[PDB]
DNA sequence: TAGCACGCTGTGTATATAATAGCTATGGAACGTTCGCCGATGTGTGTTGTACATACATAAAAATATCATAGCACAA
């Protein structure tokens, strides 16, 4: 990819003594850039990752290059260990395993052999936006190499600590514009859209009488959000496109999941059921609407479903939802003549959550994506299958929300 | 006059020779029937001691957000 050689030209310029951060999309090949840099340096390279799936991907890249089984390419994890050799090495480690404090499973010595014997020379950190934390400062404080590299896709955080990475690892060298990359490769056009649904009177006065995170249980459970949600679901099913529903709250995800009758993936869920739901979403055309929480978004991103719906949200964590949204957008690439990606933000008027979703839309403006407002698409008035459209169901839902407030 | 005893009559017995008719024991082959003592040495289990792989509540980490309290500032 041209931008990858545009990033490698900086390494080809000076050669020795260099450190910086390279911003590349998730769908791009930053791991290939790490492989090329590993071929240019030829030394013990350590790749800092947070999940085993990324370790398996880096191992697959090592297989795409050459060798992995002979005593040279090592693997560090809490399950097994593998030997290494000087002058050339490729190993992937976990942040929580290298960090620690005093808990030990007779494996911290195996890491202190890679760090004690001084077999290093190249540092690779996956997702640098997570570095602003004490454990990563300890990791950097326990390592020292000749060349450092930071592979990440985003860096927008409101912790005011992203600027420290300019001296902890190095200043950002190349930031690729996702619009020009969309022109190089169709990574699904980004259509940002907020749905403005009216707010009922009872949920408005009860919403004002509530506060903190409890008023979210009155912002999400609005009947017009169920009507507009069903209208968007039936609309996308009529267009023949799969639907992914995001929710920062597990309770709302279970409510919409059970009321819509679709599979759901949330916390404390068996992994076999998660894999079954994933296979049903990949193969079965009857399941075109999945309800995914943060566990289903951080662990895996699927290239299907051009329809992304956002209902639940948390205060301040708008940039993280923009990063996950960006992961689902960049995950969809196949060079199509159309390829229209639709992001809907179900927001209710006069609520305290839309005013942060606007900050998320500001993050979506900083990336160059297109944003437009949507009050209501004509067609919901012709859907007799809408729930909570009658005053009876609205009063019953009001009583259910009041009971939910009495439980919390 | 009938059993008993005596004399008389018929039969089997052994033998060569042939005629030349049916009658039959024999060995083989095939189908249907009830039935199937103390000492020394060596094995033989079963609950269970030992043991391994996956589940699951814990520990912890890590990542973060929001009310309360002290101090400083402002008002009835």
Between residue 72 and residue 101 of chain A, the positions with Cβ below 7 Å from nucleic chain B are 95-96, 99-101
C1’ B23 / CA A27, Å: 116
Those residues whose C-beta lies under 8 Å from the C-beta of residue A219, and which sit 6 or more positions away, are A207, A348, A351, A352, A353
Contact between the CB of A142 and strand B at under 7 Å? no
Question: CA–C1' distance A194–B27 (Å)?
Answer: 115
Q: Are A172 and A23 in contact (CB under 8 A)?
A: yes
Tokens 């169709």 belong to residue: A186
Could you list the residues of A known to form a binding site for ATP, using ranges: 24-31
* Distance separating alpha carbons of residues A176 and A159, to the nearest angstrom: 23
Torsion of CA A203, A204, A209, A212, to 10 degrees: 80
Local structure of A185: helix, strand or coil: coil
What positions of strand B are covered by protein, i.e. any atom < 7 Å from a CB? 56, 60-67
Residue A132, nucleotide of least CA–C1' distance:
B63
CA distance A391 to A201: 12
Give the Cα separation of A244 and A310 in Å (integer). Answer: 9
Lookup: nucleotide whose C1' is closest to A129 CA? B63
Query: Is A270 within 7 A of strand B by CB distance?
Result: yes
Q: Is the minimum distance from the CB of A213 to strand B below 7 Å? A: yes
User: What was the resolution (in A) of this experimentally determined structure?
Assistant: 4.7
What span, in angstroms and rounded, lies between the C-alpha atoms of A97 and A243?
Answer: 37
Whether any strand B atom is under 7 angstroms from the Cβ of A359: the reply reads no
Contact indicator for A263, A287 with CB cutoff of 8 Å: yes
Closest CA to A345 of A120, A181, A193, A176: A193
Question: For residues A104 and A374, what is the distance between their CA atoms, to the nearest angstrom?
Answer: 54
Question: What technique solved it?
Answer: cryo-EM
């Amino acid at each position: 990819r041209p931008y990858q050689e545009k990033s490698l030209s900086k390494m080809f310029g000076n050669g020795r003594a260099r450190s910086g951060i390279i911003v590349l999309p998730c769908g791009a090949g930053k791991t290939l850039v790490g492989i090329t840099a590993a071929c240019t340096i030829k030394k013990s390279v350590i790749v800092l990752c947070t999940s085993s799936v990324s370790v398996m991907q880096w191992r697959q890249q090592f297989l795409x290059x050459x060798x992995x089984x002979x005593x040279x390419x090592x693997x560090x994890x809490x399950x097994x260990x593998x030997x290494x050799x000087x002058x050339x090495x490729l190993v992937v480690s976990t942040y929580s395993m290298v960090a620690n404090x005093x808990x030990x499973x007779x494996x911290x010595x195996x890491x202190x052999x890679x760090x004690x014997x001084x077999x290093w020379g190249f540092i690779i950190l996956d997702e640098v936006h997570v570095v602003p934390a004490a454990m990563f400062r300890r990791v950097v404080s326990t390592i020292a190499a000749h060349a450092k590299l930071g592979l990440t896709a985003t860096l927008v955080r409101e912790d005011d600590k992203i600027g420290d990475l300019n001296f902890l690892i190095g200043p950002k060298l190349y930031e690729a514009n996702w619009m020009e990359l969309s022109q190089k490769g169709h990574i699904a056009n980004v259509q940002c859209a907020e749905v403005w649904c009216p707010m009922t009177a009872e949920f408005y006065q009860e919403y004002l009488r509530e506060t903190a995170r409890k008023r979210m249980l009155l912002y999400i459970m609005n009947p017009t959000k169920f009507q507009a949600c069903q209208f968007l679901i039936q609309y996308h099913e009529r267009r023949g496109d799969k639907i992914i529903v995001f929710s920062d709250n597990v309770y709302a995800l279970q409510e919409y999941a059970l009321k819509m009758g679709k599979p759901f993936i949330y916390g404390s869920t068996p992994q076999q059921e998660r894999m079954n739901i994933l296979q049903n979403f990949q193969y079965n055309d009857q399941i075109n609407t999945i309800f995914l929480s943060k566990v289903g978004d951080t662990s895996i991103d699927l290239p299907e479903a051009t329809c992304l719906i956002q209902i639940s949200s948390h205060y301040g964590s708008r940039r993280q939802e923009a990063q996950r949204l960006g992961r689902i957008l960049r995950a969809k690439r196949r060079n199509d003549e159309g390829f229209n990606a639709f992001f809907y933000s179900l927001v209710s008027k006069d609520t305290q959550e839309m005013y942060y979703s606007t900050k998320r839309q500001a993050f979506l403006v900083d990336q160059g994506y297109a944003f437009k407002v949507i009050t209501h698409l004509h067609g919901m008035e012709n859907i007799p299958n809408l729930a909570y459209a009658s005053p009876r169901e609205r009063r019953e839902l009001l009583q259910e929300v009041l009971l939910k407030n009495e439980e919390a």
